[PDB]
Design a protein around this ligand. Structure first.
Ligand code: COA
Ligand code: COA
Ligand code: COA
Ligand code: NMY
Ligand code: NMY
Lengths: 187, 191
């Protein structure tokens, strides 16, 4: 069985960051943009290498997810957001994806109030099987110039993993949920 | 001689985390209202901690957490910068003045330079000369916060407290510190 190493972005040399980026881009090839890479930087990376070649990657970066309960109170949850999860093609189906998520979920459970991610279609059963909840209500992003704006192309994609919500808060996945602002894909 | 260890929030046991919080709360003491509040501790969670311990006792702490800083340049183009935000920098009172806080900020600035486009913090009044000497820039224009119900809302209590450390600004961006700057939303003190 393989085990992922967990490394902060700042503990990654440029050679190893460039190798990770190139492995991720190839893994997403039919798609992975310059903004997509920026989104994967700043947090903890899960890495698996074999003889100096990276064969699996994932990242969890901190952001705020905003949720307003029925009673009208607002919540700005410390969110561990999962990005750039990828296994080299020739090494897929061997549990390397599971090893990446095991290490990232340890980060989420140890440090954040909620995990969240916008899953590709292929990865959906994988996350469902691990206990991630599909979000059923509308999604949105908090923009700097127009307030909260709907993001309908992301409604089907969003999964959350509530690990340490504030005392008495219970997420209703049919309500709206809002992510903080960034360039490119908000979710 | 003094070197802090870097550890992510998720690698601290609850007892070390709780000790860190108690130590930082006391460091911020000069009645029953703690100057360093529960929300203040939450803002230190989720990133990299710099720790210094001496025969088991935690004698220094600092953290850098990821946020977005929003800045609109003089050309009208908006930027959502990946920001390493510095929180809860503290040295046990009896050990101050020996380079421990310098050692904490050394480690945190390494995180910022290696991971983020910009470092930022909201400095206590008395700590401002220290940050200037380390090459942080004082922000001179108005500060604000992007709220989910109101618009961008001015935060005048934090004007003149903000410092930034621009380590990897995109392509041609050059910060003009007289313009407005805006932080993302969180509970408690936004800056
Ligand atoms: C997504 C990706 C990382 C999965 O990697 P992988 O090596 O195929 O995955 P694994 O072999 O580790 O399988 C992961 C888990 O999903 C499970 N699984 C896969 N398909 C499943 C299905 N239809 N139903 C139930 N479980 C399923 C496996 O059983 C495994 O769980 P297990 O370890 O308990 O058995 C890989 O396909 C990839 O890199 N794709 C390209 C990039 C991409 O699209 N990334 C997803 C963005 S979130
Ligand atoms: C502010 C603090 C972290 C500085 O740590 P320190 O270990 O005492 O300071 P250092 O010895 O590393 O010196 C760093 C700089 O701090 C300044 N400073 C602040 N308090 C100082 C003190 N008691 N003794 C010496 N320098 C002090 C000096 O300008 C010094 O610069 P220098 O070495 O070039 O002379 C620490 O005194 C403390 O915990 N105070 C409580 C308040 C606080 O931390 N504010 C939050 C940061 S915004
Ligand atoms: C730290 C600095 C002063 C050089 O280091 P240094 O002068 O050798 O300082 P040290 O590391 O030896 O500090 C230890 C000494 O601090 C003194 N000291 C400072 N605070 C003390 C305290 N609270 N208790 C006891 N001694 C203290 C003591 O004399 C101690 O020596 P001793 O106990 O052995 O007698 C350095 O940061 C510097 O030169 N600062 C430049 C200023 C700057 O950055 N400004 C730029 C303007 S933009
Ligand atoms: N875009 C068209 C389709 O893209 C697919 O790839 C999938 C994937 O990239 C993408 O997945 C989702 C989208 O769902 C969702 N609307 C936004 C979200 N940020 C994105 O996210 C995913 O891909 C990004 C790269 N982008 C990565 O940066 C990100 O970490 C990853 N989780 O959408 C696709 C499936 O939903 C295939 N290439 C092909 O089946 C088809 O062409
Ligand atoms: N009065 C002198 C000193 O005051 C300190 O209090 C200062 C401190 O709380 C606070 O400092 C600044 C403010 O400026 C600024 N407008 C907002 C910013 N979030 C805050 O931040 C600072 O204190 C917080 C705890 N709150 C920490 O969580 C935070 O990491 C720290 N950088 O404002 C106070 C005055 O600057 C301490 N009580 C003690 O170190 C000493 O007594």
């Amino acid at each position: 069985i393989h085990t992922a190493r967990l490394i902060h972005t700042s503990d990654l040399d440029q050679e190893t960051r460039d190798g990770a980026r190139r492995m991720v881009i190839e893994a997403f090839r039919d798609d992975f943009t310059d903004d997509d890479w920026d989104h994967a930087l700043g947090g903890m990376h899960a890495l698996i290498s074999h003889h100096g070649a990276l064969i699996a990657h994932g990242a969890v970066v901190q952001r705020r997810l905003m949720y307003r309960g029925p009673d009208g109170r607002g919540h700005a949850l410390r969110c561990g957001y999962v990005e750039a999860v990828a296994v080299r093609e020739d090494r897929r189906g061997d549990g390397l994806g599971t090893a990446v998520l095991d290490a990232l979920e340890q980060v989420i459970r140890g440090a954040y109030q909620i995990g969240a991610l916008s899953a590709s279609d292929i990865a959906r059963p994988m996350y469902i099987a691990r206990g991630w909840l599909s979000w059923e209500g509308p999604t949105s992003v908090l923009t700097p110039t127009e307030g909260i704006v709907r993001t309908p192309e992301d409604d089907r994609s969003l999964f959350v993993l509530p690990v340490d919500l504030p005392d008495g808060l219970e997420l209703d996945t049919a309500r709206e949920i809002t992510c903080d602002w960034r360039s490119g894909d908000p979710w």
